[PDB]
Amino acid sequence: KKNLGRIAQIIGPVLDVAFPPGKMPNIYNALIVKGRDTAGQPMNVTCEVQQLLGNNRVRAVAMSATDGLTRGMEVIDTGAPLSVPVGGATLGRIFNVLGEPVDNLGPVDTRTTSPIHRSAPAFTQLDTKLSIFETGIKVVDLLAPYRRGGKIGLFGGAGVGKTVLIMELINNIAKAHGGVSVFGGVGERTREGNDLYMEMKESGVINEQNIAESKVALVYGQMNEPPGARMRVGLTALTMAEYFRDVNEQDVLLFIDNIFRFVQAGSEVSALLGRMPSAVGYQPTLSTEMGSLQERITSTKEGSITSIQAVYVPADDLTDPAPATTFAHLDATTVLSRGLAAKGIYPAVDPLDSTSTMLQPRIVGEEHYEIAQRVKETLQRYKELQDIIAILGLDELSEEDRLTVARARKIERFLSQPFFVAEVFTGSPGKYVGLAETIRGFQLILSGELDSLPEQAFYLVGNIDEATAKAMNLEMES
Amino acid sequence: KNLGRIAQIIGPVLDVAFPPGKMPNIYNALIVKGRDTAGQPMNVTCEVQQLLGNNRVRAVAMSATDGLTRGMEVIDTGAPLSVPVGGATLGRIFNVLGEPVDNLGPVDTRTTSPIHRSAPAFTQLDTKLSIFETGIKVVDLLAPYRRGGKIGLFGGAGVGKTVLIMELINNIAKAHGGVSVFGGVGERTREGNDLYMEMKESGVINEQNIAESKVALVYGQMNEPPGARMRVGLTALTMAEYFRDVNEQDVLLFIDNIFRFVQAGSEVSALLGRMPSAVGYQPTLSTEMGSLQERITSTKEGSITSIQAVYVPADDLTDPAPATTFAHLDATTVLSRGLAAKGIYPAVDPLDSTSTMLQPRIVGEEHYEIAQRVKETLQRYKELQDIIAILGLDELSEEDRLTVARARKIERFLSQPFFVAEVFTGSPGKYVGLAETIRGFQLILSGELDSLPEQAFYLVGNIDEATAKAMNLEMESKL
Amino acid sequence: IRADEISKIIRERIEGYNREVKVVNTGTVLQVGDGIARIHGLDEVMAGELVEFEEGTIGIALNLESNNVGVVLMGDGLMIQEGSSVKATGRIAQIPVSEAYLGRVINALAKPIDGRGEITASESRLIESPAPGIMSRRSVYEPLQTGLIAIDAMIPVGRGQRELIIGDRQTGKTAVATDTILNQQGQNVICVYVAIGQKASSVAQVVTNFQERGAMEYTIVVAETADSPATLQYLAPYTGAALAEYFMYRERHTLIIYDDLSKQAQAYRQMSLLLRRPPGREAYPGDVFYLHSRLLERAAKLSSLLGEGSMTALPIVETQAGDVSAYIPTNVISITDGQIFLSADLFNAGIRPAINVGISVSRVGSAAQIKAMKKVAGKLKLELAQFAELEAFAQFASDLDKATQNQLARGQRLRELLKQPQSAPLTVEEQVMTIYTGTNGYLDSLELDQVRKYLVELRTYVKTNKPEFQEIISSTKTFTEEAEALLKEAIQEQMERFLLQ
Amino acid sequence: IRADEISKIIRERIEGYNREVKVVNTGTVLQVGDGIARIHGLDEVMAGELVEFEEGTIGIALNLESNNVG
Amino acid sequence: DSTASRYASALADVADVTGTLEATNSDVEKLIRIFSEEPVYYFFANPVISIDNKRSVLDEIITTSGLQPHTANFINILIDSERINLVKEILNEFEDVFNKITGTEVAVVTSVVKLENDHLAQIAKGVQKITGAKNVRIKTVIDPSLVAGFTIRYGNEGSKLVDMSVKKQLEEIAAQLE
Ligand SMILES: Nc1ncnc2c1ncn2[C@@H]1O[C@H](COP(=O)(O)OP(=O)(O)OP(=O)(O)O)[C@@H](O)[C@H]1O
Ligand SMILES: Nc1ncnc2c1ncn2[C@@H]1O[C@H](COP(=O)(O)OP(=O)(O)OP(=O)(O)O)[C@@H](O)[C@H]1O
Ligand SMILES: Nc1ncnc2c1ncn2[C@@H]1O[C@H](COP(=O)(O)OP(=O)(O)O)[C@@H](O)[C@H]1O
């Protein structure tokens, strides 16, 4: 219907398309390319503009594999930004970057659709309540409370336990509170995407038959995808979430992992866009794209869009800008230090930087505030003694400092939360703890009730009474 | 004509065009004028460094880029920029282009020396080596200045360098009967304003009657463009140059900071179509410092003693601008974040700071043994303190355990208060004489005053006052 | 109200319009890509003019070549046709200013993003009004208060002095910024919390805290959505600076909170990179130094000739992994009036605020704070520096000297005085009270961990018994013998009260 | 973007191309600044041959590109 | 100050010093007329085909179409120095560079009605008064979106532009809502 014409240049994933000189398309809008293939000329080549580049020519980004098509293909301007199916059609359907159901089910009804991106929600349409809900993982519930409706950041490198922690969190809050619960996979291991899909199928939160009763829209984007596809799947998932917070008007769960792959896709597409580079590798616009994907996550006046986003910290570099923008852009930083996983605690969470503004007396109770304090004081002191105890041994300390090291390691190995989904990984069937345990295990540790049972006697057990029973068992086996 | 257009303006870089009748030489001042945002007759002065073909030239502007629009007239002065110099140009604070920025009446502008000139050859340089005492303890002990040399303040991240400049100016401006000049080269404007207030206070500017002020204030703003800061040091240097050849008196320069000059040059050279260099800077850093530290030379005609602050970024030495600035310095004083963290001021690293004028035959062969002995025990203490921090002083054996406490007293004793820093400390400072310094240090290094507490040496001008504070501390130990 | 009354104002606005002879520079836009607009034609365009598009997403012309003009998109122009008549506006990024801003969340294009309604405004202040002159301005001689104890004590802020809050993230920097805002409740201090490039939920939280504290009646929050275009995201501190110039130029001293400045540098970096302006070191453009210089130098203290107001600045700068040797925390420390650090170690180690005086510093000094506290404890900053060294030295604690034992226990109790609860802005008289309680060694024999309880008991006891101390000294700013006597008297009484018990 | 993007050399060129020969005797400056100069002509110039400048401020030539010698 | 612009400037300046001003003007008119067709332009723009064949074809076209030896020598220098790939914008800016050196100020005054040619001469004299240019090459085209008023556009290419057609409504709808 709109401007037809010819692609003039293709550079790998990125494509430069010329047009009639009269009307050029919008910026940021989409358009398909017919092109060619082996059998048939499908519209599989969807595309999206990025930069109108002179001589009635746009420089655009692709969304699929960019082989087989050539310059001079019959490009079709769809004019609008990239539409995507929304609504109950999403529920349970494992659909893809352009919205089509790749779950080997029916093509979902296009009677309700939405463009891919929109403006930022309003200064007033931000909410006011500092909402807090627990999870069940005691280190989080102790010293990193989760701003529900806000942003919940999962940091760490690789092999430090982030997608496993996401699986545990979704294993809790899939049947816990919260209405529709959209997972998005940005750069996910697609075998692990289908793994959590089968976990949702077996756990039954998604629905085999009558799928429109699911309250889950698992719109993954596999890591195999082209850079434009990874660059857009986050916007798809956020479009689903904002659609539900505006039309379902729901407290929407927004598990996403991991948006470093999103901005890495942005970097590798900018390097072919010819935009000059930035800090150490990335695109110059990483700040603005992270600003888009964060500022379009808010708790509305009616929809507390709680997002549990992960960031792949590359090679454990907190100085790197891909952290250095996000943990400004979010509320609950949860950095997962690798060396704790080397020691063997799962989850491997330091207390010092894993923090929140929810750790506030007038939000969690002054009691829970000082509880988290008296944890954090001791563990920060343990670190500033750690860096000089590892050299030159244990007993050069005072009696007080030795006891403080013992109690800090008590808290540390006591925070070894056994995970309910990690039974098939390690063997131990995980456990669930809450706020009474959150105060009481701390209370016994810091009072000195538990003060003679060894470091294994609270190891990989959440509940402190479970730790006492484990202590009884290990004292019995002698 | 010579009226050309400005084809490209990108930052404070101005690509000026010209008809093929005239394309001027380098370094020549151009002035776009008569236009601003308010229709004002606002002028902007702009000099040239590179001339990129087709009778056109990329210029750098000594004032802000706002106002002037591409396709405007330019009026080259047919010459390099010339700074109004003279005894009438003392007193008032004025601009890089020379305009009196004191907002009262302008100085008489009849003797203008060109801002870019030849550097004096060493056949003109006064090879006379000389000794200078400036009254600050650790300096006149361990980094004794040359009355005629070049003096560097290798400063850290805003620690003691500018307050040290204020103290030293306060101590030596009255001392040197010859002329003086402070160069504000990308200095913080309110701290340069505080310096100007202190010159009004101490009467060195003599606010009620000027041109008898032997000091001369010239300043270039941080907020000014790097085209301004790239030449404000040249302005101050040329005022000192005029006083060093025409007036040929004893001239004192206090430029701050030279790294601001470096950063402005690097800044604009990134823009004016030139490659970068090693970390920080332009590829023209060595020639910039060459022009400067070859023009600030005490001549056989007239002496000069140019002191200058060097702010190294990231507080190091491998940085290339202090890697050439040390190579162009002769009296280097290197401040330390550690000694500032322990409050010891001036937070000089006496290991790092040395001077060419620390020769035994030129300081006195007992003063030299004093200086060597303090540097020896101090360097050994800095060598030992890491093992201290892991194994305990009380373990660390006695033949070094007396020396660690000795040098620990030493550094805090050579922390001495300043007459201006009393706002930061609490007690008004002291102008210490070098005989008193070597006396107190001959007490400490020998180990006569090893009975004194260490904090009795804290922030004290005289060793006699240190004994007095020691008796006071013993008195409060009883009380 | 619908179709009833406004037709007379419609006729008033129509009849009496301009019909101008305004010749304008108008440009056919050639190259828009990713927030910039390299525009063809458009010859006589002033660098810094807003350039009106087809849309209404105006733009500043930063760079300009012989053929093209580097123009940014303040407001992302999502649909701009090639060859659109993109004319400039002539004027140079002017900003409307009024006292009716006092409370409205305002966007960088002077627009109310409060929901309170549009503001009438007369003047049109430039975005690059320079710094006030060198001779024209006075030294920072007059105190300005934090409400936080340790900064006021050791490393003071003065009205006009631009102290630089700095540190790693998530260590209470924005918290102490809001605390030193809402400290100002009767000091005739306008605060301009310029929020830059962070969560709008966070800026909603801080304006919620301001509405709760009542401090939003006089403060002006310049919000910046992180979704805003990076041109706007770096432009907004200049708008905040000119808006504070609007009040400083009358007589009214004011305060400003850039929050943060590192996002300003990054957004400006993004715009300069897309403009193909070549980068300097650390992949930044070189002139973030020049940008922050023009920013912070527009913040100083007036003198009596022009209004003797002030624009004391607090640009928070974000540094990763506690570094100083990052490029923008290397530029801003050179162009600020001293810096204070918020170490993660001292924050999570209980010292909240976490300003270790070993690295933190205020480079204008006690003349920017009160004479009473001056005469009490000018020396206490260096005393605590020595205590910090000696307590690092007291790791080797086997046979400590009795004098250094008194010194370490003294500075220990002093450091315990420098702990304060969350958002408890103490009266400056109370800060004088606790600092004299420290410097006169009453607490030396007392309990070392109950000093906070000693202090709250002492301050309640004096604020009940002898509040005449506070008014006589706040009317004299001077630690006299009357202050001494009232202090030691209530000290004896409350020392008895807390000894028993 | 090209070398000899000065048009004065190109004016001389389009005036006097009409031959298949070089310019070898002397040359003119084509670009100059910061103590270096990209100059045109005198095509036979040895790698490191000294250059007799105008105003005698002589220097050595190392960049000897096609239309312009540095 | 692009490469095409400066090669245009070289050609216009050699025409100005040699007095071949309008001859080279009409010659570049017929030259861009010849370069309008993409076969010969693609023939010259292709770097694969042999340079001696390109030179022979070029000189052949020169001798047959009877052109100026100056622009002939110029385009021989262009095919030599490889800039013949840019001939479109080279000549398209050479016309305007020639107009600049001859001072002729092209001013496209569109409108909704074909104005009286005396009024064209009137506003031509007015814009020569405001510009100081030698000629004002008055250009008109009927624009339907312009309501009624004159809509000039002058300067270098399209820089300075005044309208009286939709600008009245634009002023009204702008200033009313303020
Ligand atoms: N909570 C856990 N309990 C037991 N083992 C774990 C846990 N978390 C991670 N692991 C170990 O880590 C491996 C999976 O990688 P991990 O979960 O550490 O990082 P990740 O979440 O896969 O990060 P990414 O997805 O970014 O690579 C598994 O082989 C498992 O043995
Ligand atoms: N005096 C104090 N006592 C207790 N807690 C404090 C104090 N000051 C600040 N905090 C805490 O510091 C936490 C982090 O606040 P804030 O967001 O200002 O840190 P930040 O480093 O500025 O982080 P960001 O830069 O991301 O905003 C807050 O949750 C607050 O509880
Ligand atoms: N031990 C100290 N003695 C004196 N001044 C100090 C000390 N520690 C910090 N300062 C502060 O450092 C400032 C001077 O730093 P300096 O490097 O001289 O200037 P700048 O900070 O402008 O570079 C003084 O204003 C003072 O407040």
Q: Which technique was used to obtain these atomic coordinates?
A: cryo-EM
B157 in a known ligand binding site:
yes
Q: Do A54 and C31 touch (CB under 8 A)?
A: yes
Burial group, residue C2, by CB count within 10 angstroms (0-12, 13-18, 19+): exposed
Task: Measure CA C215 to chain center.
Answer: 15
> In whole angstroms, how far apart are CA C23 and each of A386, C87, E100, E159?
72, 11, 21, 10
Percentages of chain E per state (helix, strand, coil), in multiples of 5? 60, 5, 30
Which residue of chain B comes nearest to A390, CA vs CA?
Answer: B390
Instruction: Report the separation in Å between the CA atom of A162 and the middle of ligand 1, taken as the mean of its atom positions.
Output: 6
* A359-478 to CATH, choices 1.20.1260.10, 3.40.50.720, 1.20.1250.20, 1.10.1140.10: 1.10.1140.10
- The Cα B374–Cα C384 span in angstroms is 27
Looking at the fold, whether C224 and C325 belong to one and the same domain comes out as yes
Output the residue whose Cα is nearest ligand 2's atom 16: C172
Instruction: Quickly tell me which residue has 């769960």 as its tokens.
Output: A253
Determine the residue among B386, B390, B395 to mutate to test chain A binding: the one whose Cβ has the most chain A Cβ atoms within 10 Å.
Answer: B390
- The Cα B57–Cα B59 span in angstroms is 6
Run of H or E including B228: helix B226-245
B140-B146-B151 Cα angle (round to 5): 85
Q: According to CATH, what is the number of the domain B1-80?
A: 2.40.10.170
Burial group, residue C334, by CB count within 10 angstroms (0-12, 13-18, 19+): buried
Run of H or E including B61: strand B57-61
DSSP summary character for residue C279: P
Residues composing chain C: 501
Q: Do E172 and C14 touch (CB under 8 A)?
A: yes
Could you give the 3-state DSSP secondary structure of residue A278? coil
> Is the Cβ atom of B159 under 6 angstroms away from ligand 3?
yes
Looking at the fold, whether C181 and C84 belong to one and the same domain comes out as no
Looking at the fold, whether E115 and E65 belong to one and the same domain comes out as no
- B309-346 as b/e: b if 16+ CB within 10 A: bbbbbbbeeebebbbbbbebbbbbbbbbbebbbbbbbb
Chain A residues with CB under 8 Å of B390 CB are 388, 391-392
CATH topology of domain B358-477: 1.10.1140
Residues C311/C194, Cβ–Cβ less than 8 Å: no
Q: Does the beta carbon of B394 lie under 8 angstroms from any beta carbon of chain A?
A: no
Looking at the fold, whether E32 and E87 belong to one and the same domain comes out as yes
Domain ranges of chain A: 1-81, 82-358, 359-478
Angle between helices E69-80 and E21-35 (to 10 degrees): 50
First-last CA distance in chain D: 16
Q: Which strands sit side by side in the sheet containing B304-311, from one edge to the other?
A: B217-221, B180-187, B251-255, B304-311, B150-155, B331-334, B354-355
DSSP summary character for residue A430: P
Chain D residues with CB under 8 Å of E62 CB are none
Which residues numbered 67-106 in C keep a CB inside 8 Å of some CB on A?
77-82, 105
E140-E145-E148 Cα angle (round to 5): 70
Cis upstream peptide for D68 (omega within 30°): no
Which residue of chain C comes nearest to A56, CA vs CA?
Answer: C82
Chain A residues with CB under 8 Å of B391 CB are 392
Could you give the 3-state DSSP secondary structure of residue C4? coil
- Domain final residue, candidates E103, E118, E148: E103
Q: Do B49 and D7 touch (CB under 8 A)?
A: no
Instruction: Report the separation in Å between the CA atom of A99 and the middle of ligand 1, taken as the mean of its atom positions.
Output: 30
Q: How many structural domains comprise chain D?
A: 1
Which residues numbered 41-60 in B keep a CB inside 8 Å of some CB on D?
49-55
Instruction: Report the separation in Å between the CA atom of C203 and the middle of ligand 2, taken as the mean of its atom positions.
Output: 14
Output the residue whose Cα is nearest ligand 2's atom 30: C172
A175 in a known ligand binding site:
no
Instruction: Quickly tell me which residue has 């699986």 as its tokens.
Output: A167
- Nearest-neighbour CA in chain E from B23: distance (Å): 17
Q: Determine the structural domain holding residue E41 and report its residue range.
A: 1-103
Cis upstream peptide for A3 (omega within 30°): no
Residue C426 tokens, joined:
């103490």
- The Cα E96–Cα E104 span in angstroms is 9
Residues E7/D10, Cβ–Cβ less than 8 Å: yes
Tell me which CATH homologous superfamily contains domain B81-357.
Answer: P-loop containing nucleotide triphosphate hydrolases (3.40.50.300)
Q: Does the beta carbon of C214 lie under 8 angstroms from any beta carbon of chain A?
A: no
> Is the Cβ atom of A426 under 6 angstroms away from ligand 1?
yes
C168 in a known ligand binding site:
yes
- The Cα B187–Cα B236 span in angstroms is 13
D31 part of a folded domain: yes
Which residue of chain B comes nearest to C358, CA vs CA?
Answer: B341
Could you give the 3-state DSSP secondary structure of residue A14? strand
Chain C residues with CB under 8 Å of B15 CB are 66
* Three-state secondary structure of D39-54: EEECCCCCCCCEECCH
Sorted by sequence, the CB contacts under 8 Å of residue A320 that are 6+ apart come out as A279, A280, A313, A314
Looking at the fold, whether C418 and C345 belong to one and the same domain comes out as no
Q: What CATH number does residue C120 fall under?
A: 3.40.50.300
* Ramachandran angles phi, psi of C67, nearest 5°: -115, -45
Run of H or E including A31: strand A30-33
Could you give the 3-state DSSP secondary structure of residue B16? strand
- The Cα B354–Cα B335 span in angstroms is 12
- Domain final residue, candidates E66, E81, E103: E103
C16 part of a folded domain: no
Q: Do B391 and A388 touch (CB under 8 A)?
A: no
Which residue of chain D comes nearest to E79, CA vs CA?
Answer: D14
Contact flag for C and B (3+ C-beta pairs < 8 Å): yes
Q: Determine the structural domain holding residue C34 and report its residue range.
A: 22-91
Chain B residues with CB under 8 Å of D10 CB are none
Instruction: Report the separation in Å between the CA atom of C342 and the middle of ligand 2, taken as the mean of its atom positions.
Output: 10
- Nearest-neighbour CA in chain A from C379: distance (Å): 29
Cis upstream peptide for C353 (omega within 30°): yes
Strand extents, DSSP E, C249-310: 254-259
Q: Does the beta carbon of C13 lie under 8 angstroms from any beta carbon of chain E?
A: yes
- Which ligand gives the minimal distance to the CA of C196? 2
Residues A389/A157, Cβ–Cβ less than 8 Å: no
Residue A350 tokens, joined:
């330091």
Looking at the fold, whether E21 and E75 belong to one and the same domain comes out as yes
- The Cα A79–Cα B33 span in angstroms is 49
Query: Which residue type is seen at C104?
Result: R
- The Cα E88–Cα E84 span in angstroms is 9
Q: Which atom of ligand 2 is nearest to the CA of A328?
A: 26
Looking at the fold, whether C234 and C350 belong to one and the same domain comes out as yes
Q: Do E10 and D7 touch (CB under 8 A)?
A: yes
Closest by CA position to A158, among listed A267, A291, A315? A315
Q: What is the CB-side half-sphere exposure of residue A337 using CA atoms within 13 A? A: 12
Chains that touch A (3 or more CB pairs under 8 A): B, C
Q: Does the beta carbon of D21 lie under 8 angstroms from any beta carbon of chain E?
A: no
Residues C213/C298, Cβ–Cβ less than 8 Å: no
- The Cα A241–Cα A221 span in angstroms is 15
> Is the Cβ atom of A346 under 6 angstroms away from ligand 1?
yes
Closest by CA position to B226, among listed B165, B170, B282, B175? B282
Sorted by sequence, the CB contacts under 8 Å of residue E69 that are 6+ apart come out as none
Instruction: Report the separation in Å between the CA atom of A257 and the middle of ligand 1, taken as the mean of its atom positions.
Output: 13
Looking at the fold, whether C348 and C447 belong to one and the same domain comes out as no
- Domain final residue, candidates C326, C351, C369: C369
Chain D residues with CB under 8 Å of B54 CB are 5-8
Could you give the 3-state DSSP secondary structure of residue E137? coil
Looking at the fold, whether C157 and C169 belong to one and the same domain comes out as yes
Could you give the 3-state DSSP secondary structure of residue A265? helix
| Domain A1-81, classified CATH 3.40.50.300, yes or no | no
Q: Is the dihedral of CA A258, A259, A260, A262 positive or negative?
A: positive
Looking at the fold, whether C83 and C113 belong to one and the same domain comes out as no
> Is the Cβ atom of C41 under 6 angstroms away from ligand 3?
no
* Ramachandran angles phi, psi of A240, nearest 5°: -60, -45
Residues A324/A311, Cβ–Cβ less than 8 Å: no
Residues B469/B416, Cβ–Cβ less than 8 Å: no
Residues composing chain D: 70
Looking at the fold, whether E74 and E1 belong to one and the same domain comes out as yes
Residues A312/A260, Cβ–Cβ less than 8 Å: yes
Beta-bridge mates of residue B83: B113
- Which ligand gives the minimal distance to the CA of A160? 1
DSSP B15-69: EE---TT----TTEEEEE-S--TTS----EEEEEEEE-STT-EEEEESS-SSS--
Which residue of chain D comes nearest to E6, CA vs CA?
Answer: D7
Sorted by sequence, the CB contacts under 8 Å of residue A225 that are 6+ apart come out as A97, A233
Could you give the 3-state DSSP secondary structure of residue A187? strand
- Nearest-neighbour CA in chain B from A324: distance (Å): 20
Q: Do B50 and D33 touch (CB under 8 A)?
A: yes
- Which ligand gives the minimal distance to the CA of A185? 1
Looking at the fold, whether C147 and C246 belong to one and the same domain comes out as yes
C12 part of a folded domain: no
The number of helices, as runs of H, and strands, as runs of E, in chain C is 16, 15
Looking at the fold, whether E109 and E94 belong to one and the same domain comes out as no
A90 in a known ligand binding site:
no
* Reported structure resolution in angstroms: 4.3
Q: Do C270 and A319 touch (CB under 8 A)?
A: no
Looking at the fold, whether E137 and E152 belong to one and the same domain comes out as yes
Closest by CA position to A162, among listed A348, A420, A358? A348
Q: Which atom of ligand 1 is nearest to the CA of A165?
A: 1
Residue D42 tokens, joined:
């005198």
E26-E30-E32 Cα angle (round to 5): 115
Chain C residues with CB under 8 Å of E155 CB are 25, 41, 43-44
- Which ligand gives the minimal distance to the CA of C148? 2
Mode of pairing for the β-strands spanning A45-53 and A57-62? antiparallel
Residue C490 tokens, joined:
């209530």
Q: Do B8 and E6 touch (CB under 8 A)?
A: no
Residue A474 tokens, joined:
């290990």
Mode of pairing for the β-strands spanning D50-51 and D59-60? antiparallel
First-last CA distance in chain C: 69
- The Cα A264–Cα A257 span in angstroms is 13
Looking at the fold, whether C389 and C325 belong to one and the same domain comes out as no
Could you give the 3-state DSSP secondary structure of residue B30? strand
Q: Does the beta carbon of B56 lie under 8 angstroms from any beta carbon of chain E?
A: yes
Looking at the fold, whether C362 and C467 belong to one and the same domain comes out as no
Sorted by sequence, the CB contacts under 8 Å of residue D14 that are 6+ apart come out as E10, E11, E14, E70, E73, E74, E77
Instruction: Quickly tell me which residue has 């409108």 as its tokens.
Output: E111
Out of C91, C363, C410, C459, the active site residue is C363
Which residues numbered 3-32 in E keep a CB inside 8 Å of some CB on B?
6, 9
Residues C171/C353, Cβ–Cβ less than 8 Å: no
- The Cα B252–Cα B287 span in angstroms is 23
* A82-358 to CATH, choices 1.20.1050.10, 3.40.50.960, 3.20.20.10, 3.40.50.300: 3.40.50.300
> In whole angstroms, how far apart are CA B350 and each of A321, B259, B375?
39, 22, 7
Instruction: Report the separation in Å between the CA atom of A440 and the middle of ligand 1, taken as the mean of its atom positions.
Output: 29
Strand extents, DSSP E, C16-110: 24-33, 36-41, 50-52, 59-64, 68-72, 85-88, 95-97
Which residue of chain C comes nearest to E127, CA vs CA?
Answer: C23
